Amino acid sequence: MKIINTTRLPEALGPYSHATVVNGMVYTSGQIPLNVDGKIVSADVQAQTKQVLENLKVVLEEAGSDLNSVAKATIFIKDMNDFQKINEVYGQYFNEHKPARSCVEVARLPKDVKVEIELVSKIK
Amino acid sequence: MKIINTTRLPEALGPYSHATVVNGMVYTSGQIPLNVDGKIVSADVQAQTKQVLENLKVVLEEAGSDLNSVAKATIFIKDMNDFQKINEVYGQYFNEHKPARSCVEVARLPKDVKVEIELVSKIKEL
Amino acid sequence: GAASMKIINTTRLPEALGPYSHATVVNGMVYTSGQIPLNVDGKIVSADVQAQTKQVLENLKVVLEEAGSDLNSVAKATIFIKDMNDFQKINEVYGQYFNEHKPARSCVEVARLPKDVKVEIELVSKIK
């Protein structure tokens, strides 16, 4: 069991970590579109999707993995009408390597963000 | 990292794959009740549940797993008042083998379907 | 032919009625079913959200123990909730259980939970 916490990201306040690594796999926390100051970056859903994926890129790096090693993503979104915008940004991060995915519209996310994404990835 | 795609499902057009296999485990994408032509098969929630599970069966089999090898299912539904009906269909597929599961009602699913199911399963004999 | 794993169903909790099990153990990981706040008699324990969160975490402690795991071995939790206004109260209880070890987590507001409960939690854990 390894605990992954990096000051390269907005701190996990309270009782969670950015990721764990266990049995050769990285389990990330859900990322939301905060910058390193813990501010929501934009109201724009594309901009939020980018911040999320950038944050996750960092977690994967710090955990000993990368984007091309991701097995599964779960995308929780506030509006399914944003799906095409989100998908466009997501497809910039997952271009050649295409993980398994689920995407659902939830009722509400932390801090009223529009998109939250969690990954399961293999250690390199 | 093995990427799984099967021509018995509608083509993964978009940045995903029907499933991946990593460390002897299969992670499927969430399946929705589309046939191979990308069309929703029925409005009926039981017919949708059946199509989801048949779609998952083909993904598992293409990956070298099967429904009896499932570790965990997550069932996202549009209406909890349909739970017992969805449950009845799911129990026809998971009769002998009873994996772990969660089931929650979401606000909306892709293409306004009523049910989406993802699975984590183990590869047979390796 | 089926891939080898251990199915967990303990008499310490209300039976999983129908086509699921309390947990599975596969390739050194425990996958729990989502736990809702049912008491030893199978009933919703209380309307209070902190009582429900306690009951969920105590149920999950049971499942993890019976599977050969423990809270210190959890990789990832997902907390599904009915109302983000309960998050502070839920988090206060969660943090009492995950005080020394802090797993990866996601928390989302869903439209509805089984039995109209306010919180449901699932875990993925290592064998201890």
Numbering used by the authors:
A (entry chain B): 1 to 124
B (entry chain C): 1 to 126
C (entry chain A): -3 to 124
Paper passage:
Here, we elucidated the crystal structure of SAYabJ from Staphylococcus aureus Mu50 and its function as a ribonuclease after chlorination. SAYabJ is classified as a member of the typical RidA subfamily by sequence analysis, and all six footprint residues (Tyr16, Ser29, Asn87, Arg101, Cys103, and Glu116) are conserved. The crystal structure reveals that SAYabJ exists as a compact homotrimer, which is consistent with the results of size-exclusion chromatography.
The 1.75-Å crystal structure of SAYabJ has clear electron density for 125 amino acids. Six β-strands, β1 (residues 2–4), β2 (residues 19–22), β3 (residues 25–28), β4 (residues 70–77), β5 (residues 100–105), and β6 (residues 115–122) are aligned in a single sheet, and two α-helices, α1 (residues 45–63) and α3 (residues 80–92) are packed against the β-sheet. The ball-like trimeric structure forms a hole in the center area with a diameter of approximately 10 Å, with ∼20 water molecules positioned in the interior. In the crystal structure of SAYabJ, all six footprint residues are positioned toward the deep pocket on the surface, where they are known to be involved in ligand binding. From the mutants study, we have shown that Tyr16, His18, Lys39, Arg101, Cys103, and Lys111, which are predicted as the potential nucleic acid binding groove, are important for the chlorinated SAYabJ performing ribonuclease activity.
